[PDB]
Design a protein around this ligand. Structure first.
Ligand code: CLA
Ligand code: CLA
Ligand code: CLA
Ligand code: CLA
Ligand code: CLA
Ligand code: CLA
Ligand code: CLA
Ligand SMILES: CCCCCCCCCCCCCCCCCC(=O)OC[C@H](CO[C@@H]1O[C@H](CO)[C@H](O)[C@H](O)[C@H]1O)OC(=O)CCCCCCCCCCCCCCCCC
Ligand SMILES: CC1=C(C#C/C(C)=C/C=C/C(C)=C/C=C/C=C(C)/C=C/C=C(\C)C#CC2=C(C)C[C@@H](O)CC2(C)C)C(C)(C)C[C@H](O)C1
Ligand SMILES: CC1=C(C#C/C(C)=C/C=C/C(C)=C/C=C/C=C(C)/C=C/C=C(\C)C#CC2=C(C)C[C@@H](O)CC2(C)C)C(C)(C)C[C@H](O)C1
Ligand SMILES: CC1=C(C#C\C(C)=C/C=C/C(C)=C/C=C/C=C(C)/C=C/C=C(\C)C#CC2=C(C)C[C@@H](O)CC2(C)C)C(C)(C)C[C@H](O)C1
Lengths: 178, 42, 154, 161, 175, 174, 74, 60, 172
């Protein structure tokens, strides 16, 4: 009857170990006030964006496109130095991807209107790597763990870049205490 | 948290005051960090 | 009665659709899982997409090096842009749109290649480790491990 | 330039306004010792005044003979950021507010006691609604074209003519 | 036999048409009508057979009305523009009248007409069926061969800046 | 139900022993994620390309074709690549191998359907595999030599990155 | 300043028109008083019932619009 | 119309004209306005039910 | 039954395959509110005007009429360079043409787009008529997009489409 992650708190209702990464961790009662499907879809989206974002924050320092506008090792400098029409194109393309991938059901009243729509299941499997039944739960656990780790890592990387004015790897190689 | 206290917190004057203070704080902090915006810079 | 962020319109008094299609399991290589017309995943499934991507990558190679190559007296080749190709019979429009209008690499200063990235547009790789080590460095390289060690030894 | 106005970065009366404001703050600065908190506050006010006048002078704003920026709102694209783009920002936010309020009213009509929903807000449902408002023009237009926004005239109460 | 043994046979290629060795790896016949594809193949091949002959003849023979260019491709750019437009509109008239003013894939074969058969057989030549089949095979094979040949001759004439037989002798190489 | 190659690990379920070179070696379970037909097609393509590259590195150490020494000079291994990119050789090679790989893509998708064995292009113009037993022996030899040549060409090009010699010059000079 | 004072004038004209037009068009009746035409153009009220009916006649709309007319000419 | 049906009001002077009420009782005696209709919206006097004739009432 | 342009949406109710340019595309549901035949006539007219307009943004770059040879090849300058008399004659001719459209649309029951202009009788063949009916709407929509592009590009560059292409003036 007690939460496994937080043993001095009672087990949150609507958390019953069914979803991947469920360790009964909801001390603030978000799942008692909001639906778990929207929360899982949001968690997967924040985590996937942070997976791409942490991988970018490490890789863009080491590898660049040719040109002066793509030569910033620090990612917050690359936000400003990159061509503006390209980044606006990125914004518009992300908007179109969000529009079509959710099949015109984008909001808190119409996404999951179809009963077949599963949280975080946009239908995305380009190489069909999910063709294995007993692999599925371990795959979803690995995806959500990578997403949570990526959220914490990218949050830290951005704010440490703000503190140090250094790209992450070269901050680790040229470290200066505050 | 007591459900009756949450229901009191959900009343129209409390939520009105909290939402308008939250909006005012957005306008105040935006004008603190980006003052004197007579125009949209283009 | 209406859980927050449930996303069911009938719980929010929103106009629903009623007709909710079943989700098929058929997958496309560069497409998305979802309801399609009959015949669709058999005509434009993964085979069609992969074949068209292969054909597009093949046809990119003459398009990437697009230009009028002219042999000189010494056997060398002079590449000049298709924008200088003039046509005899369209009035005052001697210059006409060409394949380089659709793919203007030189207008953006992009040295295109048949493998996209060219010699004067090469991907830049540089080692961030600055030629020093993880620990015990004496010079202009003070790592986080060195900071930990100096903090402990003080 | 437009309507006989001059750009603010070359208007001498704009410079006179800036000089007068800086002098008015500096004569207050003169009565305080350097390093005192009133001196730092007054110098920060001087810096803010200088930065504001510089930014207004480099923005393409037009100044009249009074020496103050004059906004152009006839639709020309060289002054679209003075009324048109703030107008689009307002219209987006206002349509958001109207759409989410209408959605909450229509939800509250379905409740057991609608008036209790009006005075005691269902906060999770209201937060769901205020999340829905980012796509309000397309949602409102689809609501309109499906006959779900406008109600016919024979279903609205009217007074005797 | 199949041209590509490691792929399965294209189902819409039944071997009835002349030149069918089973060669459709992309599967163009799975999407488009085979009559339209055959009409296009014969038209591309016939235009290329005439084009190969023109590239070989304009290298040596120039009518005295015109003034020859250095290469048969350069020959295009020395003609008066009105003459090229006359040729283009005459070809358009031939395309309109030979198809019965039915020029689109939705109406070209509405009357059940044979692909590539425009009823142009002036000099006899079409009474023996046993010769008709073999000449169908020869026509389609020489059409494809002249397609590839015309592509080669035009691109090589553009590159070297000299004629076809003028490049077959005194051949220089890219350096 | 344990792996023969790695006896303390389970036999992977996508591995069965039918394919040539199957010793139950997939400890990280890559065959559980990808298709085994895609993986075998990729392994055969990497192996055949590496066999050709290994033999090419050996022979390009041994000799050169007429005229290549003028264009190239004293450049060996990957150092010729950029030069032959400024020249027309690598573009022509890429064009014709891309043309072959279009039908390779169609063949791979045919295999993913299940109508074609992975790496089976039916290219036996000399009829070497008449008997099925000789076919099995040649299949095992092909997959073993392909894996060996993958390792070999990796070693050769990284030894060139270290010393700039060439695979046969490095043997004759430390 | 001319811009602002003409838009203030536009406000005052539209508001006086609102009072006067609302008085003329509700003169025959409203939801609060559907038989107003039986009571004439000018009458004090219809009593404190139905929530209270102070200044409900069209004459009262004239009376309210007089202040707005004085404001706009001012 | 019958008891429990949802009806629209056609009496012009009514507060609930062209609005929807629920029929609570239809009187069978010779009453001028025998249809009792109950409304969810209160009028200005605070009442929420009224009697109507048959011709002032249309079933929806 | 699903829409064929957008396969995850239901098919719009008031547009059918009998309409020549049908693709099942009405995500905003215009056909559910407005008069569908009015929208068909309007789409056909907007498309026909844009077909003429997309040809006429390009054609003065090839050649001009000899009386208009001094007129600019930028369409937005040549719009002004024509006097009020020539534009008045053009407007009068358009009004004469639109009188027939007025009569047919507000007082007749013909097919959408049918002003009775088929002198060559190219719709006599049924399959040809179906192809032409779809192709008119298709090229009309394409010309709508193309003229929109040409107009805003001519705003940006102050030159015609061919001239901007061959000068490669692609950046504002
Ligand atoms: C009805 C039959 C007919 C007639 C009367 C003509 C008449 C002419 N042709 Mg011609 N032609 C025809 C059929 C015909 N063609 C056909 C069927 C073909 C294709 C096989 C050609 C292919 C052809 C070529 C390739 C050339 C001509 C040229 C010419 C012109 C030569 C004189 C010149 O240069 O001064 C005229 C000089 C000018 C500057 C005036 C411009 C030319 C005008 C527009 C000619 C008008 C022709 C008229 C419309 C009839 C053509 C019918 C059409 C279906 C082809 C002359 C007017 C030559 C030409 O145009 O040179 C310029 C040229 O090079 N013709
Ligand atoms: C959160 C993701 C994210 C964001 C916002 C950026 C943003 C940026 N990157 Mg970056 N990048 C990322 C991830 C990201 N990166 C990752 C994961 C990699 C490794 C592959 C890179 C590698 C990279 C290089 C090598 C360079 C940049 C550069 C840049 C800058 C210019 C834009 C550009 O050329 O992109 C280039 C983008 C790529 C090469 C790869 C982006 C692929 C992303 C992850 C999209 C894939 C997911 C996509 C949405 C499909 C999912 C749809 C499905 C969910 C329905 C810009 C500040 C340039 C720069 O300024 O240098 C510092 C540059 O030279 N990026
Ligand atoms: C409907 C009338 C109206 C309108 C259109 C505006 C519009 C504006 N006011 Mg104003 N204002 C109004 C009524 C109005 N106000 C009233 C009634 C008062 C008195 C309570 C004020 C008191 C006031 C002050 C004291 C200030 C403004 C400021 C601003 C600017 C907002 C800058 C901003 O938030 O950037 C948004 C930035 C983002 C990053 C988002 C903008 C031009 C500020 C400004 O910049 O002035 C130019 C400012 O300092 N206004
Ligand atoms: C009082 C009436 C009035 C009205 C309603 C307008 C309305 C407009 N003017 Mg304007 N104008 C007016 C009087 C008026 N003007 C006067 C009196 C002058 C002279 C001082 C001007 C001088 C003027 C200039 C110089 C320009 C405008 C422009 C515009 C348009 C820009 C808005 C937009 O984004 O649309 C355009 C976008 C869409 C319709 C769709 C986008 C989504 C808009 C239609 C601009 C324009 O482009 O006009 C055509 C422009 O450059 N106006
Ligand atoms: C759900 C919110 C909502 C919506 C969509 C509308 C919509 C409308 N109102 Mg209305 N109104 C509202 C609330 C709302 N009203 C409230 C609360 C009041 C009392 C102050 C009024 C007082 C009012 C008057 C006096 C007039 C209108 C008018 C109008 C119309 C024109 C728009 C306008 O003038 O806006 C302007 C609206 C206001 C100035 C008042 C809005 C007050 C707040 C900002 C909106 C409420 C937000 C709400 C708290 C959201 C909660 C949602 C949350 C629980 C999820 C339009 C039909 C006008 C009309 O008839 O035009 C034809 C008119 O003359 N309204
Ligand atoms: C891409 C590789 C390549 C390159 C750059 C060259 C380049 C050259 N070859 Mg060559 N050649 C090649 C491959 C190549 N060849 C191959 C594969 C063969 C087949 C064995 C030949 C056979 C060959 C002969 C027989 C001759 C050349 C000759 C020449 C030179 C002409 C002067 C020129 C530098 C000529 C020369 O003088 O070189 C010595 C010459 O006579 N080549
Ligand atoms: C029939 C098809 C065909 C055609 C028309 C061409 C045309 C050309 N190739 Mg080419 N090529 C082809 C197929 C073809 N290739 C194939 C299948 C391959 C292998 C993938 C190559 C590999 C290749 C390379 C590496 C080079 C060319 C080059 C050239 C250009 C030489 C121009 C010149 O003056 O040389 C005229 C030369 C001759 C007339 C004599 C050449 C005779 C050679 C030496 C015989 C080679 C025999 C060879 C071993 C057999 C191939 C079998 C192989 C598949 C196993 C020209 C554009 C060169 C280039 O771009 O330079 C600018 C270049 O360096 N090609
Ligand atoms: C800040 C700078 C700008 C940066 C922002 C970049 C923008 C990003 C690219 C745009 C991506 C945004 C997505 C657009 C939101 C659409 C959401 C949506 O429609 O919700 C979906 C809403 C849902 O609407 C609900 O639908 C229900 C269905 O039963 C009921 O009808 C409800 O009444 C109705 O409210 O409406 C739709 O169903 C309509 C779909 C239309 C989507 C296609 C859009 C077509 C593109 C428009 C372009 C036209 C070009 C102009 C014409 C000239
Ligand atoms: C089937 C098909 C055809 C066939 C065909 C094709 C042409 C088959 C021909 C194939 C050849 C290319 C096989 C190549 C093997 C290469 C070896 C394994 C790599 C060894 C590397 C190791 C030893 C090493 C290295 C080492 C290290 C790393 C670095 C160096 O310093 C030293 C050193 C070099 C020692 C034919 C024509 C028969 C017809 C048939 O009908 C159909
Ligand atoms: C009625 C009928 C007939 C009649 C008839 C009439 C005469 C029919 C003839 C009609 C013409 C006017 C049709 C024109 C279509 C123009 C569009 C499709 C081209 C759009 C270009 C777009 C794609 C673009 C552009 C692009 C822009 C944006 C950016 C550029 O950088 C690039 C690019 C240039 C590519 C006749 C007489 C036969 C009789 C019959 O009995 C009845
Ligand atoms: C779905 C699947 C697709 C796939 C896909 C995608 C491409 C898969 C890629 C997923 C990738 C992007 C995973 C990214 C993980 C990054 C996370 C774990 C970590 C950050 C590390 C943290 C701890 C840190 C940091 C730290 C910070 C805080 C402080 C610093 O001082 C130190 C340090 C830097 C160490 C494909 C396309 C293949 C198709 C297939 O059919 C279906």
């Amino acid at each position: 009857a007690k939460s496994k992650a937080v043993p001095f708190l009672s087990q949150p209702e609507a958390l019953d170990g069914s979803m991947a990464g469920d360790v009964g961790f909801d001390p603030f009662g978000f799942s008692s006030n909001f639906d778990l499907k929207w929360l899982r879809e949001a968690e997967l989206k924040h985590g996937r964006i942070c997976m791409l974002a942490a991988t970018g924050c490490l890789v863009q320092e080491v590898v660049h496109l040719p040109g002066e506008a793509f030569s910033q090792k620090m990612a917050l400098n690359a936000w400003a130095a990159a061509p503006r029409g390209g980044m606006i194109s990125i914004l518009v393309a992300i908007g179109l991807i969000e529009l079509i991938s959710n099949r015109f059901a984008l909001t808190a009243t119409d996404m999951f209107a179809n009963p077949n729509r599963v949280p975080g299941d946009l239908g995305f499997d380009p190489l069909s790597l999910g063709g294995n039944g007993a692999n599925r739960a371990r795959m979803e656990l690995a995806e959500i763990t990578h997403g949570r780790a990526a959220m914490m890592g990218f949050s830290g990387m951005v704010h440490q870049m703000l503190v140090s004015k250094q790209a992450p790897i070269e901050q680790l190689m040229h470290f200066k205490a505050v | 948290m007591d459900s009756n206290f949450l229901k009191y917190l959900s009343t129209a004057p409390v939520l009105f005051t909290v939402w308008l203070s939250f909006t005012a704080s957005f306008i105040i902090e935006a004008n603190r960090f980006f003052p004197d915006m007579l125009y949209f810079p283009m | 009665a209406a859980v927050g962020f449930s996303g069911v319109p009938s719980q929010f008094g929103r106009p629903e659709s009623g007709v909710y299609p079943a989700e098929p399991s058929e997958q496309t290589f560069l497409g998305m899982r979802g309801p399609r017309a009959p015949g669709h995943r058999e005509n434009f499934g993964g085979k069609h997409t992969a074949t068209m991507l292969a054909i597009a990558a093949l046809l990119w190679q003459p398009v990437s090096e697009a230009g009028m190559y002219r042999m000189q007296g010494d056997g060398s080749l002079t590449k000049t842009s298709f924008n200088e190709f003039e046509v005899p019979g369209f009035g005052n429009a001697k210059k006409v749109p060409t394949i380089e209008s659709l793919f203007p690499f030189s207008s953006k200063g992009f040295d295109a290649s048949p493998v996209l990235f060219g010699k004067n547009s090469m991907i830049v790789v540089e080692d961030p480790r600055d030629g020093c080590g993880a620990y015990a460095n004496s010079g202009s390289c003070h790592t986080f491990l060195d900071e930990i060690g100096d903090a402990l030894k003080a | 330039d437009v309507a006989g106005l001059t750009p603010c970065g070359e208007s001498k009366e704009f410079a006179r306004r800036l000089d007068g404001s800086v002098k008015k703050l500096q004569t207050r600065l003169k009565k305080y010792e350097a390093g005192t908190p009133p001196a730092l506050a007054l110098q920060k006010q001087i810096d803010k005044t200088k930065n504001r006048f510089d930014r207004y002078g480099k923005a393409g704003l037009l100044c009249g003979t009074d020496g103050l920026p004059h906004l152009i709102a006839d639709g020309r694209w060289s002054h679209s950021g003075e009324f048109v783009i703030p107008g689009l920002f307002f219209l987006y936010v206002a349509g958001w507010i109207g759409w989410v309020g209408r959605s909450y009213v229509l939800f509250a009509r379905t409740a057991d006691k609608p008036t209790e929903k009006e005075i005691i807000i269902d906060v999770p449902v209201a937060l769901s609604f205020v999340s829905t408002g980012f796509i309000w023009p397309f949602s409102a237009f689809k609501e309109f074209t499906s006959g779900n926004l406008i109600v016919p005239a024979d279903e609205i109460t009217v007074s005797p003519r | 036999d199949n041209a590509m043994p490691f792929l399965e046979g294209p189902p819409k290629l039944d071997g009835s048409l002349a030149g069918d060795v089973g060669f459709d790896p992309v599967g163009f016949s799975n999407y488009f009508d085979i009559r339209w594809l055959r009409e296009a193949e014969l038209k591309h091949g016939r235009v290329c057979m005439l084009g190969v002959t023109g590239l070989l003849v304009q290298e040596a023979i120039c009518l005295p009305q015109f003034a020859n260019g250095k290469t048969p491709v350069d020959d295009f750019f020395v003609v008066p523009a009105a003459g090229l437009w006359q040729v283009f509109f005459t070809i358009g008239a031939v395309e309109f009248f030979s198809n019965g003013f039915k020029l689109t894939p939705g109406d070209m074969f509405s009357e059940g007409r044979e692909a590539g058969d425009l009823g142009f057989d002036p000099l006899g030549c079409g009474k023996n069926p046993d010769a008709l089949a073999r000449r169908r095979l020869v026509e389609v094979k020489n059409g494809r061969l002249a397609m590839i040949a015309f592509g080669g001759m035009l691109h090589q004439q553009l590159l070297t800046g000299q004629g076809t037989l003028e490049q077959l002798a005194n051949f220089k190489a890219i350096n | 139900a344990m792996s023969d190659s790695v006896p303390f690990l389970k036999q992977p379920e996508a591995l069965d022993g039918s394919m040539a070179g199957d010793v139950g070696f997939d400890p990280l379970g890559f065959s559980s994620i990808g298709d085994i037909n895609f993986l075998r097609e990729a392994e055969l393509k990497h192996g055949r390309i590496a066999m050709l590259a290994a033999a090419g590195s050996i022979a390009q150490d041994i000799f050169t074709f007429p005229g290549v020494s003028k264009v190239v000079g004293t450049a060996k291994m990957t150092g010729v690549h950029d030069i032959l990119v400024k020249q027309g050789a690598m573009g022509q090679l890429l064009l014709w191998l891309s043309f072959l790989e279009v039908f390779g893509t169609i063949a791979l998708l045919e295999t993913l359907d299940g109508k074609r064995a992975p790496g089976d292009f039916k290219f036996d113009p000399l009829n070497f595999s008449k008997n099925p037993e000789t076919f099995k022996r040649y299949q095992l030899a092909e997959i073993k030599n392909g894996r060996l040549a993958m390792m070999g060409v990796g070693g050769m090009v990284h030894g060139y990155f270290i010393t700039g010699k060439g695979p046969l010059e490095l043997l004759g000079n430390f | 300043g001319d811009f602002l004072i003409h838009h203030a004038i536009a406000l005052a004209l539209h508001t006086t028109t609102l009072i006067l037009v609302k008085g003329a068009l509700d003169a025959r009746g409203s939801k609060l008083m559907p038989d107003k035409k039986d009571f004439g153009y000018s009458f004090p009220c219809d009593g404190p019932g139905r929530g209270g009916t102070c200044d409900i006649s069209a004459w009262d709309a004239f009376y309210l619009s007089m202040f707005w007319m004085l404001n706009t000419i001012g | 119309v019958k008891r429990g049906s949802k009806v629209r009001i056609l009496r012009k002077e009514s507060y609930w004209y062209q609005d929807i009420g629920t029929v609570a009782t239809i009187d069978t005696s010779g009453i001028r306005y025998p249809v009792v209709v109950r409304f969810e919206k209160v009028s200005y006097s605070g009442v929420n039910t009224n009697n109507f004739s048959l011709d002032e009432v249309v079933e929806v | 039954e699903m829409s064929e342009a957008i396969p995850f949406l239901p098919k719009p109710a008031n547009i059918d395959a009998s309409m020549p340019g049908y693709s099942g595309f009405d995500p905003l549901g215009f056909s559910d509110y407005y008069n569908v035949k009015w929208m068909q006539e309007a789409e056909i007219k907007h498309g026909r005007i844009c077909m003429l307009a997309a040809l006429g943004m390009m054609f003065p770059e090839f050649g001009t009429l000899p009386q208009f040879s001094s007129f600019s090849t930028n369409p937005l300058e040549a719009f002004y360079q024509v006097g009020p008399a020539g534009w008045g004659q053009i407007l009068l001719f358009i009004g004469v043409l639109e009188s027939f459209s007025y009569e047919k649309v507000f007082y007749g029951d013909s097919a959408p787009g049918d002003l009775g202009f088929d002198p060559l009788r190219m719709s006599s063949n049924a399959a040809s008529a179906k192809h032409y009916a779809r192709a008119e709407v298709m090229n009309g929509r394409l010309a709508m997009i193309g003229f929109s592009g040409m107009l805003h590009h001519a705003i940006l560059t102050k030159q015609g489409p061919i001239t901007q292409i061959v000068e490669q003036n692609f950046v504002p």
